[PDB]
Amino acid sequence: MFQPLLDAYVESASIEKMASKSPPPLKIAVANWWGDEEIKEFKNFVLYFILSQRYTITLHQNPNEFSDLVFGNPYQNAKRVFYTGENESPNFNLFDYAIGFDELDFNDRYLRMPLYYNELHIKAESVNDTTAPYKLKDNSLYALKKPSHCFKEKHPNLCAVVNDESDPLKRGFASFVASNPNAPIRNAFNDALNSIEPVTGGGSVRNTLGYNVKNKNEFLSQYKFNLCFENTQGYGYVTEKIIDAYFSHTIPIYWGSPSVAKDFNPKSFVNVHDFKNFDEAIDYIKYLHTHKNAYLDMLYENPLNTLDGKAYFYQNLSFKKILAFFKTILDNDTIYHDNPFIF
Amino acid sequence: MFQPLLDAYVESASIEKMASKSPPPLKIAVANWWGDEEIKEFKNFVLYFILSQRYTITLHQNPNEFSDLVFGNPYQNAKRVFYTGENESPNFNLFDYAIGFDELDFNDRYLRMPLYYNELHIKAESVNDTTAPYKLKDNSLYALKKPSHCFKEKHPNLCAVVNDESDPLKRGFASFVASNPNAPIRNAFNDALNSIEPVTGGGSVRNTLGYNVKNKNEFLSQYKFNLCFENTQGYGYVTEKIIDAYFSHTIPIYWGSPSVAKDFNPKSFVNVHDFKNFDEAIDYIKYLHTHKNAYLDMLYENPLNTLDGKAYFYQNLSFKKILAFFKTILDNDTIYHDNPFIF
Numbered sequence: 001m002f003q004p005l006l007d008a009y010v011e012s013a014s015i016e017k018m019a020s021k022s023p024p025p026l027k028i029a030v031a032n033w034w035g036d037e038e039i040k041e042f043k044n045f046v047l048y049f050i051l052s053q054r055y056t057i058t059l060h061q062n063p064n065e066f067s068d069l070v071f072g073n074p075y076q077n078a079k080r081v082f083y084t085g086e087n088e089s090p091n092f093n094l095f096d097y098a099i100g101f102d103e104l105d106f107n108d109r110y111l112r113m114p115l116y117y118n119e120l121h122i123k124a125e126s127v128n129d130t131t132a133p134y135k136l137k138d139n140s141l142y143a144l145k146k147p148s149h150c151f152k153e154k155h156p157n158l159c160a161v162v163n164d165e166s167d168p169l170k171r172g173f174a175s176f177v178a179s180n181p182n183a184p185i186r187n188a189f190n191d192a193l194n195s196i197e198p199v200t201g202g203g204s205v206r207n208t209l210g211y212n213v214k215n216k217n218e219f220l221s222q223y224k225f226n227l228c229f230e231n232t233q234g235y236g237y238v239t240e241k242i243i244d245a246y247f248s249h250t251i252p253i254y255w256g257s258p259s260v261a262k263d264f265n266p267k268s269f270v271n272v273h274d275f276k277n278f279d280e281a282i283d284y285i286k287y288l289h290t291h292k293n294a295y296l297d298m299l300y301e302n303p304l305n306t307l308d309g310k311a312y313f314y315q316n317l318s319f320k321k322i323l324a325f326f327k328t329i330l331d332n333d334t335i336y337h338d339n340p341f342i343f
Numbered sequence: 344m345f346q347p348l349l350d351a352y353v354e355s356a357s358i359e360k361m362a363s364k365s366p367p368p369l370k371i372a373v374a375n376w377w378g379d380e381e382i383k384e385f386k387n388f389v390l391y392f393i394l395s396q397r398y399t400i401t402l403h404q405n406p407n408e409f410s411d412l413v414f415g416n417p418y419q420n421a422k423r424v425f426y427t428g429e430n431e432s433p434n435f436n437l438f439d440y441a442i443g444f445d446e447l448d449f450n451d452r453y454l455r456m457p458l459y460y461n462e463l464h465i466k467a468e469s470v471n472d473t474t475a476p477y478k479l480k481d482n483s484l485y486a487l488k489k490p491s492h493c494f495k496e497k498h499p500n501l502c503a504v505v506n507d508e509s510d511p512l513k514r515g516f517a518s519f520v521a522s523n524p525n526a527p528i529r530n531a532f533n534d535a536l537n538s539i540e541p542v543t544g545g546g547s548v549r550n551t552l553g554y555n556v557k558n559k560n561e562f563l564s565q566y567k568f569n570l571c572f573e574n575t576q577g578y579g580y581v582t583e584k585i586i587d588a589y590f591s592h593t594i595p596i597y598w599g600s601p602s603v604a605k606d607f608n609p610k611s612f613v614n615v616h617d618f619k620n621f622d623e624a625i626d627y628i629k630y631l632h633t634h635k636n637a638y639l640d641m642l643y644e645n646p647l648n649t650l651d652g653k654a655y656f657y658q659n660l661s662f663k664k665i666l667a668f669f670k671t672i673l674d675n676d677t678i679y680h681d682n683p684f685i686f
């Protein structure tokens with residue numbers, strides 16, 4: 001159920017504005033190779049957005065300045081914050097701090113931030129609309145920016161099956177929107193799942209349709225199931241793929257993170273680790289399409305777990321908690337990473 | 344200049360008003376194993392649109408009904424029309440007529456329709472906006488509909504340089520929006536063009552950003568070149584790819600059709616055929632790309648050719664030619680496809 005999954009991130013975005021518009025400044029360095037179309041990504045994905053409210057920012061494509069937010073992986077003796085999207089371990093001998101998906105900890109030295117807070121953020125960059133279903137909090141961080149109308153034309157069916165101007169069981173079985181081959185679990189599972197009911201591909205891999213899809217979310221809304229396999233297996237490797245399936249009034253058939261039920265509710269989606277073998281991963285669904293009174297619940301289930309009434313994110317993923325990492329970052333200036341003293 | 348390419352196609356779609364609101368009916372057959380999101384294409388590719396003004400249509404996913412025009416790419420002793428998009432030769436033994444890409448004559452049994460007639464179709468239909476750069480002639484087939492208002496928010500970098508609000512020296516070298524691997528042509532010349540100066544990808548194959556962009560008209564305008572190669576080679580096989588670089592005020596670096604010059608102007612895109620090899624290709628581009636006076640007149644250039652002043656389609660491809668292509672169909676009763684009799 002996406003409506004709480006959006007209303008929840010909004011409360012995790014609950015912060016206080018600043019005293020004056022003398023916002024404490026900041027200097028940022030990145031990997032050498034990133035570009036304006038990837039630096040607009042740097043300013044558009046969720047991280048710069050939270051530095052956009054507390055601190056003041058000016059970016060640097062020159063290592064000819066000494067700075068505080070040094071990202072990337074292209075420098076030796078500086079103040080360097082990690083930040084990934086791919087499955088990459090953290091190495092605190094070259095860097096200082098880390099933003100990963102490891103269900104880890106290193107005191108004030110690691111900040112697990114899965115890239116499912118970027119599509120969650122980013123899913124709120126489209127709902128600031130007059131022709132949108134999912135609701136923001138009034139005069140919140142996202143409602144403070146001017147509204148638009150690019151939503152009724154893009155999504156006419158995703159705008160439908162959610163608001164109950166249409167049915168969810170009068171749609172199709174499974175859809176496949178993977179485009180990368182190096183993922184043997186992601187690919188193969190199209191085999192088995194298909195020999196029981198057709199599966200629709202939309203990438204370069206197992207492409208069933210006939211056309212390559214431009215809007216990935218209008219796609220799944222015409223389906224009753226989405227397949228959310230990551231490219232590689234990783235405890236915490238839960239990305240935006242699950243989100244683009246929750247957002248689409250469909251069911252994610254998830255596999256990749258052997259520790260996923262912490263992140264989101266194991267009852268609202270199909271978790272493929274929750275099985276002893278693979279043919280049970282196919283059994284779970286064949287009970288749900290057929291006996292609809294059981295397809296409702298999972299479909300009508302909250303992505304998030306609950307707390308004596310209240311619904312939450314795992315490990316208190318919030319706008320604030322991230323700051324109790326960066327504030328401590330700015331703060332202690334111990335050069336943990338090996339002081340580069342070549343012989 | 345996309346305006347003339349926007350002026351040409353539109354008046355090819357000029358037909359008088361309906362002299363009688365009793366549009367001649369017509370029942371049509373299709374294939375079987377597609378669905379909702381796939382059969383809507385038989386209404387949405389370049390036939391039903393033209394006819395939903397002229398003939399009255401009722402498609403059939405039900406084989407127990409009567410039809411004259413049998414399309415698809417999947418009954419066998421009736422009147423059948425061959426219609427392809429892929430690479431697959433004429434087949435006069437299975438279907439009766441042909442509606443394809445080759446340069447063949449079989450009297451009324453061949454009509455060469457390259458695929459770009461369906462992107463000129465849509466590229467006139469995705470620009471039916473109030474906030475678009477390409478202004479349509481008033482009160483034509485598209486201007487009859489209600490103008491939208493979602494182009495300048497989705498395409499700000501496309502609307503601009505056509506409204507003349509940008510520098511063309513200030514866009515990246517080459518873009519590459521292709522996601523098929525088995526095409527060394529579109530996988531080596533890339534590296535050949537790329538292992539020189541960066542080429543930017545926008546799919547799964549030879550990617551650059553680390554994401555597949557859903558907006559394919561805005562990506563090419565943040566660059567100077569598009570790599571309008573084909574997967575393989577074919578006479579008369581012109582696709583839709585060539586249009587979308589023509590559409591986006593960028594340059595196609597083209598390969599695929601050794602007769603595209605018959606379709607379009609060869610002094611307006613970069614043609615790898617008109618060279619002895621690939622290594623001759625880079626010399627001419629380090630001119631246009633770097634000798635602006637060649638990137639303009641080629642950007643000021645009509646995609647189509649001209650005929651002592653005015654432009655044309657190859658083989659006079661128009662509505663009537665296709666309209667009066669089907670009249671003959673409803674004319675000759677002669678069974679042509681291989682009469683299947685078993686003894």
Ligand SMILES: C[C@H]1O[C@@H](OP(=O)(O)OP(=O)(O)OC[C@@H]2O[C@@H](n3cnc4c(=O)[nH]c(N)nc43)[C@@H](O)[C@H]2O)[C@@H](O)[C@@H](O)[C@H]1O
Binds near residue numbers: 182231
């Ligand atoms: C089978 C392959 O699976 C892959 O990994 P994984 O199974 O985790 O899937 P993922 O790579 O994590 O999927 C990323 C996709 O990115 C999002 N997105 C945003 N805009 C667009 C858009 O405009 N077009 C498309 N197509 N996608 C968009 C979502 O759509 C999401 O679905 C390969 O990396 C390989 O592992 C390979 O096996």
Ligand SMILES: C[C@H]1O[C@@H](OP(=O)(O)OP(=O)(O)OC[C@@H]2O[C@@H](n3cnc4c(=O)[nH]c(N)nc43)[C@@H](O)[C@H]2O)[C@@H](O)[C@@H](O)[C@H]1O
Binds near residue numbers: 526529571
């Ligand atoms: C390198 C690979 O080349 C391919 O062939 P070819 O080099 O002819 O390119 P083509 O396959 O003919 O390109 C089709 C693309 O379809 C259009 N389109 C419409 N909406 C979208 C959209 O939303 N996302 C994307 N990505 N594309 C969209 C254009 O974007 C166009 O560019 C493979 O078939 C292989 O040959 C392989 O080698």
